[PDB]
């Protein structure tokens, strides 16, 4: 409660959030789904757990302190490139260092939060050029701010 | 022997359950990945 | 009955997807068939040396549809219900677990045990532990 907000402190200005949920603010709240988005516009990468649970406790139209409860809850400050990285060598059965693409989209697709074909397919047309695929490279990427 | 065919359905379930505990731990990491890809692509 | 039958079928199939690439080596598919519940000789699958998840859930509804696997692997103790009573060793089933299986613990075949025999009886009750487990 204390450190998701000193993390929101430190990762987002608060200038720019408050600007961007005026954007979209309709009579000074938005929507939870709106709210996922702004996050990810201000940097911050919420699941889709996140959101379910905060709508859970919280409702599903956000004033400005709920949205800034809600972001707060997404600044995931314990987010570091080797756990990712240790995500996809799981499947890497040699640690060799690389993924096909069929093993990145089948991962990306099944497993957790998965993504539809239309999301990885943009995700691929950017990153998935060969079929033998670096994936701390693509964590890395994934992961500058 | 007899008891084999027992043993080894006996075995594959707990072999599956192995997986499952390996990949608990894994994939909440597979989640974060998936929120920076969708962050990525807003 | 059925999404249930299903939903076993593609769980197991993405435990067992070690590399995760979306197709299980014939290996990988029979362990996967038999951690459903499910007896299964090593050369009696059906399927080719890939296997994609559609021709697993294919094999799967042509082998629930003509027994009740569960009630199969229940049938499998019956040589060794030596009282006829619906039950066997525990003590039997430890041993037997300890010569046969190479991938369990010893830790891990105590927990399967504790599981099948919580009161500590000496006798596992199987139907009503096949039922648990599966
Ligand atoms: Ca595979
Ligand atoms: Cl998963």
Not at chain 1, 64 to 76: D, P
Not at chain 3, 11 to 38: M, P, W, Y
Not at chain 3, 54 to 57: D, V
């Given at each position: 409660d204390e450190d998701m907000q000193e993390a929101l402190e430190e990762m987002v200005e608060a200038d720019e959030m408050y600007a961007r949920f005026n954007a979209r603010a309709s009579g000074g709240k938005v929507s939870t789904g709106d709210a996922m988005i702004l996050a990810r516009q201000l940097g911050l990468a919420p699941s889709y757990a996140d959101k379910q649970a905060?709508?859970?406790?919280?409702?599903?139209?956000?004033?400005?302190?709920?949205?800034?409860?809600?972001?707060?809850?997404?600044?995931?400050?314990?987010?570091?490139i080797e756990d990712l990285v240790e995500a996809f060598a799981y499947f890497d059965v040699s640690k060799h260092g690389y993924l096909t693409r069929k093993q990145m989209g089948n991962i990306l697709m099944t497993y957790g939060e998965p993504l539809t074909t239309e999301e990885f397919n943009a995700l691929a047309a950017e990153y998935f050029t060969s079929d033998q695929i670096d994936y701390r490279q693509f964590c890395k990427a994934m992961l500058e701010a | 022997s007899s008891w084999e065919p027992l043993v080894s359905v006996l075995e594959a379930y707990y072999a599956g359950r192995r997986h499952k505990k390996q990949l608990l731990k894994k994939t909440p990491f597979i989640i974060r990945a998936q929120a920076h890809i969708r962050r990525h692509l807003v | 009955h059925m999404s249930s039958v299903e939903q076993k079928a593609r769980?197991?199939?993405?435990?067992?997807?070690?590399?995760?690439?979306?197709?299980?080596?014939?290996?990988?598919?029979?362990?996967?068939?038999?951690?459903?519940?499910?007896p299964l000789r090593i050369q009696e699958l059906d399927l080719p040396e890939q296997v994609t998840y559609?021709?697993?859930?294919q094999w799967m509804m042509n082998r629930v549809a003509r027994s009740d696997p569960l009630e199969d692997l229940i049938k499998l103790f019956a040589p060794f219900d030596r009282k006829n009573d619906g039950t066997i060793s525990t003590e039997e089933l430890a041993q037997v677990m300890k010569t046969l299986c190479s991938s369990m613990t010893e830790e891990d075949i105590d927990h399967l045990i504790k599981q099948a025999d919580p009161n500590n009886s000496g006798n596992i009750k199987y139907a009503e532990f096949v039922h648990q487990c599966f």
């Open positions: 905060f709508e859970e406790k919280s409702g599903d139209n956000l004033d400005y302190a709920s949205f800034q409860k809600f972001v707060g809850t997404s600044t995931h400050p314990e987010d570091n | - | 769980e197991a199939f993405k435990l067992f997807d070690r590399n995760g690439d979306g197709e299980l080596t014939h290996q990988e598919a029979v362990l996967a068939v038999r951690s459903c519940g499910i559609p021709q697993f859930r």
